[PDB]
Amino acid sequence: SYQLEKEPIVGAETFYVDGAANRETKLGKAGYVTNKGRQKVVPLTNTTNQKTELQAIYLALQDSGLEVNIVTDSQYALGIIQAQPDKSESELVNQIIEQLIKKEKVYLAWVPAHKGIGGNEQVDKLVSAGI
Ligand SMILES: CCOC(=O)c1c(O)c2cc(Oc3ccc(N(CC)CC)cc3)cnc2n(O)c1=O
Ligand SMILES: [Mn+2]
Ligand SMILES: [Mn+2]
């Protein structure tokens, strides 16, 4: 019930997402930074990096118009969303799936972590602080 655009969507806002989890305390943050100065950071308790990365995307999907460009450094989350499942065993993923269906156009790009990608580093620096 959804598909990913092969190209960045002209006119749409670019959401740089990221997550961070502390392995001992299970504490993590998830959020985004956009090319338009929009930001969000949420707190999460009892969690993993994977989950925080998915949560960041959920945030980006929730706080965006009918058209989005999303760039993530999560191969894990890219995997799930590119697989285009109809239903998952994960509550968080099911929430993401239905968000994507609500959208006119969705573009999801992958970028490597800590390689100087401005938007990625910006959002990393925010979610990493205190973890
Ligand atoms: C600020 C420093 O952060 C980093 O250097 C950093 C990562 O080490 C990192 C690792 C990732 O992939 C993995 C995530 C978790 C695991 N594990 C669970 C299966 C084991 C820990 C393995 C690979 C995915 N994203 C990451 N991001 O965004 C980072 O900023
Ligand atoms: Mn990451
Ligand atoms: Mn990071």
From Swiss-Prot:
Binding site for Mg(2+) 2: 18, 53, 73, 124
Bilayer-crossing regions: none
Domain RNase H type-1: 9-131
Marked site: Cleavage: 15-16
Protein name listed in UniProt: p15
Organism: Human immunodeficiency virus type 1 group M subtype B (isolate LW123)
Lineage: Viruses, Riboviria, Pararnavirae, Artverviricota, Revtraviricetes
Full protein: residues contained: 1014 to 1143 of 1435
